[PDB]
Symmetry: D2
Subunit: 270 residues, 4 copies
């Protein structure tokens, strides 16, 4: 019952979860369900896709076709698709929640630029948990980070291709900044053979790849005699679907500006 | 080389660690080393006790004997001993770092009262780690605490007699307050047989007792799809010795008032 | 391409997973797909249900209807349903893989009795992982169990109603037997207030209930100076679907007898 | 009250623990306490060193001086020292428990050779826990190792110089053998940048270095839907002192042969 949303990528891993997350969320209605033209346009929506009910909400291929059908557009697709939707939403004040990744500089640039006519939440990671952990780790670095050893460990399924995750990296920068240094001057990503002694001031990263682990991140601050650990474990991708939808909702009343989860979660004044 | 400290309880589990912690700390000198009269007054100090060097600093039995020998008094003994030292330090402006526990109301009351003539740091738990975790858990409860399930797990050695630790309890109150409720209205300490379903809004506590674990505390905030955990592991009692000494030092320049670790660590503005 | 299986409960939480697990497994074909008569008999199978392909394999309501369609019958339904299927399979030598739980003594009794005419794998827990852990914990108890403190911790989602899980309980008995004692003479399930000291020889159990955790079990053997932990984490119910299907397959060539996972996994000679 | 032992290295990190472990153990008496000639020959033993009692047992510098004073010799010193003691014990049938590491091939060779005249327990790691875990991990690999991803994670204090520990390496070989392959053909020790996908069949190792962690080892076997983890956490070096002393005792009645913990712990028939 409020704000309607459109879900681009409706049959992809993220669009389904996004449908379930949307229904399930209150204060949000499911306006449109896009997919691209050429697929089996997998039975005009419903629980069709999102294994849910049925919903007279049926998947489509046309942006202008639905224009009056949603208020906020949520995208977890591909940079190229995004940029198109971006142009349309921008044309007709339609807010975006964007979680597609891998833009090039030009990519990102359109986004900030579309951001003065529409309201956009753009974020790398939409898990609330993760966004809080990043805030915590700062504080934490404030008082313990200094004199404590700092090591980040992250585990992911056997098909993740980049080591150490992007979240581990953000964790790393979050801290290094806190200590007001540069991640690049103090990071160590590998430890094989005779290393000699751990170097004070660095931030080691350890990386585990196995099974279907969706994502676990732990930050450690070790002194002599005690350890503080802050771990975030994602159990399923619903974790981002939930936080995308929460932000769609938060966009309510919002005319324009570029935002992220700190904005949504008000981690700022926190 | 600065501020000298006296260490009451010099041959007890805490007084040794406290000697090592003191030497090792910089900006602090070891002025006096008390024990009570009647013991083997275990070879007038040194590495004697604290397995350290030797130090022309030799253990004693007389408060007035050392009065000019230390500036700050650190006590991890017994309420009764404390109250005495308390009276002496109070007489002659001598600051206290107090970590003795188990006062009765009258106990605590003398303390606050001695607190207008001398400067005292009185704390239940002097581990920095723990004190930060407690600050974090609040913040955390702020944004996730609400709609997330909250469970505290703590492990301790097989001779701890009270379940769930005092730290778990403080963890619990730290949160419940954050959510602005009462720990007493929402706590669950045991789960045996047919419980039926977990009740939204409660804070379960699980308690593990085994071996020589000095102390591990984990707070969990579980949603559907993700978990944030904040764990503090004490590896040795040096963790409190360190933070007692850090507070002794912090007391420098301090005339009077009652304080604790939030004060020492400035967790306040944090 | 081999052995066909029928999946009773085809639209329940377990029957879908069981369909996916079956296709995906090799050396196994999907013969029949039952549901009971009266439901929306959720579109005669396929990826219909198990979000899979389509499969000319369509859900049904009639046991005799499919009799020539499967070789082994897999049941994760209700005791009452089971007992029926049981009678049919027993009539016409059809092997069972049974994972339905909660029989009464009479229940279990039919099962052992059907077991001399057909081959049945009956198990409480069909996760391979868990079945290995239970074997390990014995061995383990053999050499460390004795003089080490033993504590079992288990976490499950907020709608589990019985504390401490059935797996924790089996873990407990697995050990107690190893030490050749009785679980009932040495178990402790709760620890609230002044407990006094941990009692040598007992097996404490700690129980965590939160979010959507599907199931985590940890067994601890703590001495002075070291801890051995054996943890099994279920990430999704596919873990049992997989092991049910593996047993269906194992049943190949098997005329009759009652078996379980130790049999399937040959944990016996292990 | 039985078997006396001599402890070479009596003031080193290991010799003290070894004294405490010895007294504390029953069925073992403390015969001699060596150190080398030139040190402060730290007050002829007692709780002197091992912070224990006093013991008319006083530290020495002469092997022949004590020859009638102990039955079994325990060494955690240096290869060079070892080789000497080795020659003496060999001369006069005196059993050895050896935990000194870093021999060269010639080193090891003397040992096996001294092993036909005296009885020696020679082991890299004397923690019982670790020795059981290694046995478990085999079994485990037997049934799950194959099709599961295998990752070893180990943490150690900030002054350990070799990555991945020797225990992680032994863990690795223990498994690889189980699967009957070669550790060297399937190990991966580092994961930095674009790795591409995890390769089936390898054994990744992740390495954490921080604070004063004495040693934590975890072996993981991950499938789709479940994980089995076997973790061993050393809390203090007493863990090896205990197992050295247990082996000294086990040596009782033993004339000659080369042995290790599997022998002591009978992990063989296990
Ligand atoms: N930021 C976050 O927290 C977060 C989390 C998870 C994934 N993601 C991102 O979300 C996106 C979705 O990934 P996914 O796992 O759903 O995988 P996927 O392959 O299932 O997603 C592809 C989806 O996008 C649609 N799409 C592709 N190209 C398109 C085009 N040109 N025009 C229109 N529709 C197009 C596809 O039709 C499909 O629906 C990715 O960019 C991923 O990087 C982000
Ligand atoms: N607050 C913290 O973070 C923290 C942490 C650990 C322990 N503690 C507390 O510190 C204290 C020390 O415990 P401990 O493990 O050292 O055990 P312990 O038995 O070793 O401590 C006893 C010490 O106090 C001395 N003492 C006892 N009674 C005395 C008296 N009447 N007058 C003078 N000296 C006296 C004893 O002589 C001995 O030195 C306890 O109160 C404990 O509750 C606090
Ligand atoms: N042993 C294991 O490792 C294991 C693991 C998980 C669950 N289980 C068990 O498997 C079963 C399935 O649970 P579920 O989560 O799929 O939940 P569910 O509610 O989805 O399962 C019910 C399914 O059984 C069918 N069914 C019910 N009554 C029937 C009847 N009289 N005749 C025929 N069909 C009938 C329903 O139609 C439905 O398909 C339960 O008994 C559960 O205890 C066992
Ligand atoms: N195998 C195990 O499980 C295990 C565990 C821990 C350490 N270790 C080994 O045990 C040994 C002890 O290490 P440590 O931490 O006690 O450190 P350390 O520096 O305290 O040990 C040195 C000790 O050996 C003595 N020593 C040195 N050279 C000697 C010589 N030539 N002749 C006689 N005495 C001599 C020193 O006097 C001192 O007592 C090392 O080899 C270490 O690698 C083994």
């Amino acid at each position: 019952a409020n704000i309607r949303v459109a879900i681009a990528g409706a049959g992809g891993r993220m669009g389904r979860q996004l449908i379930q997350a949307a229904l399930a969320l209150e204060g949000v209605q499911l306006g449109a369900a896009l997919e691209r033209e050429g697929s089996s346009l997998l039975g005009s929506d419903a629980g069709e896709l999102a294994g849910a009910g049925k919903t007279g909400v049926t998947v489509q291929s046309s942006l202008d076709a639905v224009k009056d059908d949603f208020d906020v557009f949520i995208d977890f697709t591909r940079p190229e698709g995004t940029l198109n939707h971006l142009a349309f939403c921008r044309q007709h004040g339609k807010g975006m929640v964007i979680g597609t990744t891998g833009f090039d500089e030009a990519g990102k640039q359109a986004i900030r630029d579309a951001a003065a006519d529409i309201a956009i939440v753009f974020a790398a990671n939409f898990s609330v948990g993760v966004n809080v952990m990043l805030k915590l780790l700062e504080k934490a670095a404030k008082v313990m980070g200094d004199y404590t050893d700092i090591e980040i460990i992250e585990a992911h399924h056997r098909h993740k291709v980049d080591a150490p995750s992007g979240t581990a990296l953000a964790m790393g920068e979050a801290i290094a900044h806190a200590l007001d240094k540069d991640l690049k001057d103090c990071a160590v990503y590998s430890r094989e053979g005779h290393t000699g002694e751990r170097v004070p001031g660095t931030i080691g990263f350890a990386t585990v790849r196995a099974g279907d682990i969706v994502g676990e991140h732990t930050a450690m601050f070790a002194d002599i005699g005690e350890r503080l650990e802050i771990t975030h474990k994602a159990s399923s991708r619903m974790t981002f679907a939930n936080g995308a939808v929460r932000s769609a909702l938060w966009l309510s009343g919002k005319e324009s500006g570029l935002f992220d989860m700190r904005d949504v979660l008000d981690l700022n004044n926190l």
